[PDB]
Amino acid sequence: TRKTYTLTDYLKNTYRLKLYSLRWISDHEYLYKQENNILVFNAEYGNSSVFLENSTFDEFGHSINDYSISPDGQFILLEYNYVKQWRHSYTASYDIYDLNKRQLITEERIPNNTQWVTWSPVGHKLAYVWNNDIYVKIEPNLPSYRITWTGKEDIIYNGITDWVYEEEVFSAYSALWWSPNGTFLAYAQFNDTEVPLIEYSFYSDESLQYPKTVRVPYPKAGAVNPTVKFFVVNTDSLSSVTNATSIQITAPASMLIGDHYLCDVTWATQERISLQWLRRIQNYSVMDICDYDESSGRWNCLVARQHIEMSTTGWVGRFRPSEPHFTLDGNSFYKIISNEEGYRHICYFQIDKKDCTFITKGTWEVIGIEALTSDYLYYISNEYKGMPGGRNLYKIQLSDYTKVTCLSCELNPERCQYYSVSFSKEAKYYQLRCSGPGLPLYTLHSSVNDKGLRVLEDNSALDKMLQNVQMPSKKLDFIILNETKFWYQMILPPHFDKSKKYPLLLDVYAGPCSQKADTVFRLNWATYLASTENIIVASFDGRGSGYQGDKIMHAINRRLGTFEVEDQIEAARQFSKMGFVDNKRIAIWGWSYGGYVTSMVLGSGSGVFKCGIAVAPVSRWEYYDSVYTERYMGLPTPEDNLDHYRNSTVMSRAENFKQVEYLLIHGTADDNVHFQQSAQISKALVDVGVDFQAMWYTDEDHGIASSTAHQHIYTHMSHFIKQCFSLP
Amino acid sequence: TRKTYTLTDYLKNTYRLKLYSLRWISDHEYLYKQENNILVFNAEYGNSSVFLENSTFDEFGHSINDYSISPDGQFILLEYNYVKQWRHSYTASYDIYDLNKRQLITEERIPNNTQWVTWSPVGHKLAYVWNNDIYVKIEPNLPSYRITWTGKEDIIYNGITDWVYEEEVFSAYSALWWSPNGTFLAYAQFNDTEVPLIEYSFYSDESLQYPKTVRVPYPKAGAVNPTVKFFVVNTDSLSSVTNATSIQITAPASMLIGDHYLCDVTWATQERISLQWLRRIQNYSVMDICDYDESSGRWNCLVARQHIEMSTTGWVGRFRPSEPHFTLDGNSFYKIISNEEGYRHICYFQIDKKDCTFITKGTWEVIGIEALTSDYLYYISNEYKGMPGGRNLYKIQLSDYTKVTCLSCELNPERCQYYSVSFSKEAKYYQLRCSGPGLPLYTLHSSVNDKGLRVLEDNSALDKMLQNVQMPSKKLDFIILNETKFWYQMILPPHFDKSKKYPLLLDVYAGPCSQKADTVFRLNWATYLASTENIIVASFDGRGSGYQGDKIMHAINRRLGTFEVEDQIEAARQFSKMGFVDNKRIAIWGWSYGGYVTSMVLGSGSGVFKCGIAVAPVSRWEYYDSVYTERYMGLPTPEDNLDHYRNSTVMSRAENFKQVEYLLIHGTADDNVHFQQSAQISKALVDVGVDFQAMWYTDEDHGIASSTAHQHIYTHMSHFIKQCFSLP
Ligand SMILES: *[C@@H]1O[C@H](CO)[C@@H](O[C@@H]2O[C@H](CO)[C@@H](O)[C@H](O)[C@H]2NC(C)=O)[C@H](O)[C@H]1NC(C)=O
Ligand SMILES: *[C@@H]1O[C@H](CO)[C@@H](O[C@@H]2O[C@H](CO)[C@@H](O)[C@H](O)[C@H]2NC(C)=O)[C@H](O)[C@H]1NC(C)=O
Ligand SMILES: *[C@@H]1O[C@H](CO)[C@@H](O[C@@H]2O[C@H](CO)[C@@H](O)[C@H](O)[C@H]2NC(C)=O)[C@H](O)[C@H]1NC(C)=O
Ligand SMILES: *[C@@H]1O[C@H](CO)[C@@H](O[C@@H]2O[C@H](CO)[C@@H](O)[C@H](O)[C@H]2NC(C)=O)[C@H](O)[C@H]1NC(C)=O
Ligand SMILES: *[C@@H]1O[C@H](CO)[C@@H](O[C@@H]2O[C@H](CO)[C@@H](O)[C@H](O)[C@H]2NC(C)=O)[C@H](O)[C@H]1NC(C)=O
Ligand SMILES: *[C@@H]1O[C@H](CO)[C@@H](O[C@@H]2O[C@H](CO)[C@@H](O)[C@H](O)[C@H]2NC(C)=O)[C@H](O)[C@H]1NC(C)=O
Ligand SMILES: *[C@@H]1O[C@H](CO)[C@@H](O[C@H]2O[C@H](CO)[C@@H](O)[C@H](O)[C@H]2NC(C)=O)[C@H](O)[C@H]1NC(C)=O
Ligand SMILES: *[C@@H]1O[C@H](CO)[C@@H](O[C@H]2O[C@H](CO)[C@@H](O)[C@H](O)[C@H]2NC(C)=O)[C@H](O)[C@H]1NC(C)=O
Ligand SMILES: *[C@H]1O[C@H](CO)[C@@H](O[C@@H]2O[C@H](CO)[C@@H](O)[C@H](O)[C@H]2NC(C)=O)[C@H](O)[C@H]1NC(C)=O
Ligand SMILES: C[C@H](c1nc(-c2ccc(S(C)(=O)=O)cc2)no1)[C@H](N)C(=O)N1CCCC1
Ligand SMILES: C[C@H](c1nc(-c2ccc(S(C)(=O)=O)cc2)no1)[C@H](N)C(=O)N1CCCC1
Ligand SMILES: *[C@@H]1O[C@H](CO)[C@@H](O)[C@H](O)[C@H]1NC(C)=O
Ligand SMILES: *[C@@H]1O[C@H](CO)[C@@H](O)[C@H](O)[C@H]1NC(C)=O
Ligand SMILES: *[C@@H]1O[C@H](CO)[C@@H](O)[C@H](O)[C@H]1NC(C)=O
Ligand SMILES: *[C@@H]1O[C@H](CO)[C@@H](O)[C@H](O)[C@H]1NC(C)=O
Ligand SMILES: *[C@@H]1O[C@H](CO)[C@@H](O)[C@H](O)[C@H]1NC(C)=O
Ligand SMILES: *[C@@H]1O[C@H](CO)[C@@H](O)[C@H](O)[C@H]1NC(C)=O
Numbered sequence A, B: 001t002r003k004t005y006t007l008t009d010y011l012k013n014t015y016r017l018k019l020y021s022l023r024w025i026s027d028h029e030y031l032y033k034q035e036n037n038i039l040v041f042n043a044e045y046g047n048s049s050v051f052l053e054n055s056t057f058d059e060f061g062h063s064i065n066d067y068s069i070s071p072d073g074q075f076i077l078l079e080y081n082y083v084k085q086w087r088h089s090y091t092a093s094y095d096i097y098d099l100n101k102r103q104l105i106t107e108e109r110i111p112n113n114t115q116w117v118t119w120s121p122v123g124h125k126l127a128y129v130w131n132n133d134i135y136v137k138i139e140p141n142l143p144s145y146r147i148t149w150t151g152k153e154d155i156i157y158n159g160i161t162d163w164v165y166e167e168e169v170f171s172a173y174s175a176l177w178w179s180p181n182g183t184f185l186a187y188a189q190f191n192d193t194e195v196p197l198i199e200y201s202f203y204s205d206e207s208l209q210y211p212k213t214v215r216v217p218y219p220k221a222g223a224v225n226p227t228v229k230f231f232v233v234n235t236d237s238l239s240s241v242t243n244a245t246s247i248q249i250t251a252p253a254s255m256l257i258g259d260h261y262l263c264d265v266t267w268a269t270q271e272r273i274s275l276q277w278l279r280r281i282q283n284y285s286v287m288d289i290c291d292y293d294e295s296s297g298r299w300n301c302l303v304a305r306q307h308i309e310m311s312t313t314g315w316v317g318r319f320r321p322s323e324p325h326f327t328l329d330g331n332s333f334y335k336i337i338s339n340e341e342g343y344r345h346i347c348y349f350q351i352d353k354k355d356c357t358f359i360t361k362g363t364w365e366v367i368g369i370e371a372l373t374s375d376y377l378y379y380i381s382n383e384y385k386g387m388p389g390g391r392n393l394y395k396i397q398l399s400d401y402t403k404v405t406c407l408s409c410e411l412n413p414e415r416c417q418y419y420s421v422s423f424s425k426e427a428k429y430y431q432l433r434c435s436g437p438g439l440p441l442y443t444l445h446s447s448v449n450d451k452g453l454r455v456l457e458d459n460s461a462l463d464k465m466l467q468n469v470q471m472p473s474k475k476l477d478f479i480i481l482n483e484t485k486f487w488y489q490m491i492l493p494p495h496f497d498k499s500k501k502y503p504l505l506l507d508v509y510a511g512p513c514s515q516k517a518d519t520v521f522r523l524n525w526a527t528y529l530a531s532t533e534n535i536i537v538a539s540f541d542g543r544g545s546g547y548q549g550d551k552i553m554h555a556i557n558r559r560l561g562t563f564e565v566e567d568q569i570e571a572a573r574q575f576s577k578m579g580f581v582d583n584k585r586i587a588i589w590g591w592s593y594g595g596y597v598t599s600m601v602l603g604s605g606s607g608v609f610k611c612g613i614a615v616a617p618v619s620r621w622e623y624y625d626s627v628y629t630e631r632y633m634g635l636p637t638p639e640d641n642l643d644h645y646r647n648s649t650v651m652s653r654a655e656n657f658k659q660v661e662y663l664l665i666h667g668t669a670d671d672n673v674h675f676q677q678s679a680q681i682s683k684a685l686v687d688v689g690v691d692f693q694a695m696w697y698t699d700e701d702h703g704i705a706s707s708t709a710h711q712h713i714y715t716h717m718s719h720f721i722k723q724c725f726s727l728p
């Protein structure tokens, strides 16, 4: 009788999840935007005050995209004229409002088209990047000091990353790192001089007569990579009469012998900085720990304080070497690394000691270190109940590792099995964000005795609306394969009846270290498919998936397009044998890496799938970037791993597509997985006489997320799936 | 039951049409290829001999793409390494074979990557273009004489056309013209220095890691055009002077005042050349007739010999001012021009008299002048039976214009109504090529007595095969609209029954001077649709179509996207009113201009059509080239015709597409109608939430003619059509 969750509900966002994004400004207070007003909250009592009026900038003219209060609450950086670039990069215009004198600064303002800006960690200094060069402002209203002068579009990047470093290494545009108290400003410099350019058309509005050609330095597998240099400058000794002096910290000799990457920068103390370097063959990384020499004014990194991290079974770290977590005095540090059994755990290092000591162990993994005090280290792991798709917050006593306490496990076991956390400045307080299997729940806690102070947001409004809807349920479980358990999830239609046969859609990603089977609550396309079309949407984490140890994750090392593809077919095979699945109506779909796997599956000749949809798929690894591809595949040379590069393409399986229905989709302005990848798939299908469905999205990138494109792609795929399953 | 003409029959060319391609080498001998053997034929008796044994070039070590015999029969030009470029241009390697000595010339060989090469009209002189510069060889084995040094890729073109001159002006790649006896070499020079470039990706083989960006000087509507210059060099002096002087012949003052084009070059005698220039606003053209001045070595064009041709109703010429045909002495010439009534007829000009005399007249038109002797002028027209869609050969007596004989009308009136002709060197013989309505028939005739010498090819073999097949029929008729007759044709299913309701597919092109209703016999996609799918495939020539006078052709002047679009809609109405059409199943489709008209029709909101397919459509006139677009649309400026330019786009009708099923298709390497045109249609449809079908063809151009793509696209379109008409 009640309505179902429809395609329109998903597309129009009828049912919204409420959140509670706060920002810690001290060890006791946080900012929260309410009614467009920014309020300051006292964590102990829950009382608040208005920090900034939503009306204060009424006659500002420009539409503010975001704001950023200086650490000392004295200034607020206003961001506007936002123009997106890649996944993290963008340029904007900035203005600064003096909160003390309630006045907007008009002298020496930050330039327009600024690529990145950031307050110093303490006080109110500024460091921004413009035209690829670094600038520092000791005071909001004072003239800025030019730090670098080599900045050159698409060639030299100071303080910001190029395309590949942004996407595959730092997951940020930013390549600036303020020392703890703001004395030093460390930055990286990238040189893409010999990096080939990916070129593609951009059509723009109808009014543009000639299409524009976008050119982006983008190193494909085996190509020339950007080179990197690291520098540290003293912002306390800057002169208006002399060009600032930047001190360079060179990479270790073991890295200089060949191509390499700078993969991590983490300050230990006011005068100690750590950096990790990664060889192009990503199974060997080195950590340098460098101390400032007050006499010479140089930075020295004692060889005795070097830390090597390598792997024999695969690459290093999940996507890159993990970040260290230094103690107060910076003499020791905690870092997640795979142990001798292949599971990622916390190892305790002494800076000038080679062997580290594991403080956690077991057939499960630590996801991340979240906070550290002299008595405790707080972290998230999937240990609880052995569910690799669950996440809980734990604390471990540094003086006795046998004492591990779970802080989120038992708060509400039925509703919450997946948490992330946010600690205040000195870990005095923490916010728990539960996101599944029930509706998101946000809470505030105090560390001293782990008290549950109060509920910030429980989504009771949403829960009330969802009561009048026939919502699907989610089953999370596992199947066995060679004495190994692999998890999967099924979004089951409302009133699931195991005596009936339901068509089944396999939602896949399956890239290395991926996880598509978890306890997270989601309102997405699958929700509609199961609620309205009574289609079962399943996902499976096979070989190559993460958070279950290296034996599983490294199974596809140097072998992409093999086991993770085979395991998806196996899962579907097993699901088709279950009583509630109509083995005549089984489909598969994926986006990005999932598009690749979906394509490899459809072209495998397995006969298990009737149809499938691939969105922006990778088609041959030589078309994807160096940093990510080489991480798993090595180099595409005959002496390294070229053969597997050549027979792991979608194109080579073209002929096998004759017995399935295939829908191939891709945005023409995809800067990540180039349209080229789908252009070559379609040509190969054409070459063997295989008919298929296609859709390109003019000017859309990898996310095909503009409002209209988003509604259009999902509307189009819905028709395809319904048609494939013979649904009304 | 006799089998039908299936889709596979079409795509596989099972029922092959035979033809008879011969090459006159003199006034009574021609070459014909039989079993890869080149034979020479005596026209008068039909006997032959082997001119070049098929096994002559086995050890050539290369597959020969084409050959060319020097006028004097002494040498043969061998063309290999063929590399297609645009519609007419291509690159290739060449070797010259000495027929006398039966050896292959190995000295001073024609360079590889030669853009164009042509024998002199007499003798065996050679002129060729390499790296955009002109070269001449007096003897096949001797060194070449360089003629130009300004050649520069994509910038300066000597002796060859740039993109727009090749496609829209000369319908050829070559821009050089030998004088009748070969003494002079005339040529054009194009400068595209300021012409904007169209840029698009070319993905090539799967092995290419980075896509290639194809860049070509291409002037869109209202953009900067290439400028041109004309020169004449005396090749007979090449061996006597170090650097022969290229004498320039400047355009007339009436053209130099603004942008203009060189549109025709035709030699009249050994020392007189005629040139026609066309203003950028193509409704005014001027012909200069220039004589060589033996004492000054210069070329002068007496204004007394200049001829003006303009139009008040439209542009000049069908697609460009027509070519003149001079009498032997070069003192007079015949040119096709539209008379006072708007019909194109032959006008006889005296070179120094501005008033010409029409030698033909009537409410029909002369298609072309085929040959001229001292006694007769032979031409093709559509006068016979008042059928604008028919074509016949006529002979008019020069000393008595009232004496006009139709040489082909009555040869076989039921089987042949569309003729084409090929005269021997001095018009002593002529091959008639009947192409419909029955099977093609090739016959040879003697000019002295206009007697049929013999049948060359009658397609008896195919006629035999077509017997066991249920072939469709073709009806050619007309409907009266506003007191004017408008022709149409229908491909009717076998056993057509007027008492039934048949789904109807409107096959459209409809560009200016187009003709989709004729008497030509075709074996194509429509054949299969009528024969197997029992679909009626119709075509209509409304306002704007050609060969029926300027009142009809110039009806869309400055107004593309209006009448030719509406008339096509009105035609469908008229057909449904004929009683044998299922008004619930009316589809429309077209390629190129047909794609545009189809799109405009589908987006007009007429309700008449259910679905439609546009292949490589134009979507907004500002995206197409200057020469073609401006010819009908004038300039896209507020002072000229911008308002209609902005008003005749497909994008502006996006919202109406919600009423129909649309399949949009386009080749990504279309250098003619850029992919851009379809990219903008799709974005516009996505922007208003309209679902549709799409297909891109990787690396295909405007013809989507590669073997695999051709089969793939017609297969894809058949599924869509069958689906729309609800056919098994
Ligand atoms: C941030 O840390 C730096 C380094 O410890 C501090 O600078 C030092 O301060 C001492 C005491 O004033 C001086 O004797 C040293 O010469 C300084 N070293 C350098 C490299 O400048 C700095 O004062 C700290 N900043 C804040 C705000 O506390
Ligand atoms: C890091 O991985 C590479 C790649 O597997 C290892 O380098 C060589 O790999 C090839 C196979 O591609 C073998 O033939 C060589 O024996 C490997 N060693 C050398 C020196 O070339 C490399 O050994 C790995 N490093 C570590 C520490 O495991
Ligand atoms: C076609 O046949 C005619 C008639 O036979 C050939 O004429 C030749 O005429 C010359 C005169 O110089 C005689 O010496 C030859 O003996 C004749 N040929 C024959 C076969 O008798 C003519 O050459 C033939 N043309 C072709 C292309 O085969
Ligand atoms: C092609 O046309 C261009 C004009 O756009 C000519 O280039 C100009 O040449 C003059 C004289 O040498 C220079 O002073 C200008 O600076 C040039 N202008 C530009 C925009 O480049 C060019 O010389 C012409 N080429 C030929 C062979 O005629
Ligand atoms: C042949 O003659 C032409 C025309 O005089 C020469 O071309 C000129 O070359 C000079 C210097 O190289 C340039 O400054 C002129 O602009 C050119 N004019 C033209 C129309 O191209 C050509 O260089 C001569 N060739 C030889 C070998 O002397
Ligand atoms: C081709 O035509 C040219 C031009 O008429 C001929 O060259 C002229 O020949 C006459 C002799 O009859 C001389 O008086 C002139 O000096 C030549 N003019 C030029 C520009 O060269 C040429 O002889 C003819 N070629 C043939 C093979 O008949
Ligand atoms: C939250 O409540 C406390 C009182 O319980 C507020 O008051 C503290 O700070 C005020 C200004 O800084 C003073 O007026 C009070 O004397 C002081 N009280 C105590 C016990 O310290 C506090 O400011 C409030 N915080 C917010 C963000 O409103
Ligand atoms: C950026 O990297 C380039 C490439 O390595 C540096 O220049 C080098 O490469 C140039 C082009 O190949 C050569 O012509 C140069 O000789 C070579 N070395 C130098 C010093 O230019 C370039 O200097 C780098 N720029 C910076 C600021 O580091
Ligand atoms: C970035 O652009 C803005 C907007 O152009 C600049 O602000 C001024 O804007 C007014 C009108 O909007 C113009 O008349 C001025 O030329 C602009 N500049 C100034 C100094 O007033 C802004 O200044 C630009 N950023 C920087 C650093 O100059
Ligand atoms: C950095 C980008 C990345 N994203 C992920 C990821 C991990 C888990 C999942 S999930 C949670 O869906 O399983 C989904 C995506 N891996 O790599 C990566 N440059 C990227 O965009 N590529 C596209 C094709 C191959 C890599
Ligand atoms: C030169 C090209 C041309 N071809 C024709 C033509 C005439 C009759 C017909 S028919 C015989 O099918 O009616 C079919 C095509 N017009 O223009 C012209 N540059 C071209 O390629 N464009 C593409 C879109 C608009 C022009
Ligand atoms: C701030 O603005 C919002 C809308 O932008 C308005 O609804 C709200 O009432 C304002 N806040 C206050 C305190 O009035
Ligand atoms: C700083 O360096 C730049 C370029 O190296 C130079 O042009 C500028 O004059 C220098 N400024 C000072 C104050 O020395
Ligand atoms: C074990 O199982 C894997 C798949 O999980 C399979 O590929 C392999 O062949 C099996 N046997 C061994 C020895 O690994
Ligand atoms: C000439 O070569 C062709 C193609 O190889 C062949 O078909 C033909 O038989 C040859 N000529 C003769 C007389 O056999
Ligand atoms: C053309 O290219 C081929 C292939 O490299 C070469 O061997 C040959 O000599 C060239 N011919 C000429 C005329 O330059
Ligand atoms: C040519 O066409 C333009 C645009 O319609 C017009 O203004 C002009 O008068 C025409 N010229 C002639 C000679 O007809």
Ligand code: NA
Pocket (backbone or CB within 6 Å): A452, A453, A454, A455
């Ligand atoms: Na509480």
